[PDB]
Design a protein around this motif. Structure first.
Motif, short mmCIF file in Angstrom:
data_model
loop_
_atom_site.label_atom_id
_atom_site.label_comp_id
_atom_site.label_asym_id
_atom_site.label_seq_id
_atom_site.Cartn_x
_atom_site.Cartn_y
_atom_site.Cartn_z
N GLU A 95 1.00 -0.94 0.16
CA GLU A 95 -0.09 0.03 -0.20
C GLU A 95 1.03 1.17 0.48
N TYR A 96 1.99 1.42 1.37
CA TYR A 96 2.79 2.78 1.02
C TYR A 96 3.67 2.58 -1.04
N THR A 97 3.68 1.19 -1.89
CA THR A 97 4.09 1.32 -3.28
C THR A 97 2.32 1.63 -4.20
N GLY A 98 3.20 2.53 -5.60
CA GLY A 98 2.45 2.61 -6.65
C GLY A 98 3.00 2.46 -7.44
N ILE A 99 2.43 2.58 -8.73
CA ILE A 99 2.59 2.72 -10.32
C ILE A 99 2.30 4.08 -11.01
N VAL A 100 2.92 4.36 -12.36
CA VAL A 100 2.50 5.29 -12.88
C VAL A 100 2.52 4.83 -14.05
N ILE A 101 1.91 4.38 -15.58
CA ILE A 101 1.44 3.33 -16.69
C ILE A 101 1.43 4.14 -17.59
N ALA A 102 1.92 5.35 -18.59
CA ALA A 102 1.37 5.26 -19.80
C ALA A 102 1.20 4.57 -20.99
N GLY A 103 0.92 5.56 -22.07
CA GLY A 103 0.55 4.09 -23.21
C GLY A 103 -0.55 3.14 -23.48
N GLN A 104 -1.65 3.96 -21.54
CA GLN A 104 -2.07 2.67 -20.78
C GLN A 104 -1.09 1.24 -20.62
#
Lengths: 104, 52
Positions: A95-104
């Protein structure tokens, strides 16, 4: 009832509730965290000194321990060098960690 | 290898030797002894068996 203090979502799924996949396309992740969740364990294998080969220890600059060991075969006239390390990456609180992905 | 000498209860010599293979990633440990059992005069020796 004993699980209620540990709840993390506002409701249980409906019957046959639909699933939406976020990764519609393959994409490289940009990584985010709050400190203390993402960790490296570092360990040292017990390569013996005095028995057979030369054994000695160093670190990477990031602090991981490395064993260097050298065995000389005087018949073929060659030293073989082995560099080795033992480690374990873990995410203790995902929960303390996340991600962003582009191009869907 | 590393080699040591030790003595048993009977005064027999033990050799202990330890060899580390850094490609296999193992020590091999060998304990070894050399002896002979001798009955020089088998008439000076006897046995009793019970239960026939």
């Amino acid at each position: 009832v004993a699980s209620r203090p540990y709840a993390n979502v506002d409701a249980k799924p409906a019957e046959s509730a639909a699933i939406t996949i976020l990764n519609k396309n393959a994409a490289p992740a940009n990584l985010f965290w709050a400190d203390g969740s993402v960790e490296l364990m570092y360990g040292k294998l017990a390569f013996p000194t005095g028995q057979g080969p030369q054994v000695m220890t160093a670190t990477t600059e990031q602090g991981a321990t490395l064993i260097m060991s050298y065995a000389f075969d005087h018949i073929k006239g060659v030293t073989t060098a082995r560099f080795t390390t033992l480690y374990g990456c873990s995410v203790l609180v995902p929960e303390y960690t996340g991600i962003v992905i582009a191009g869907q």
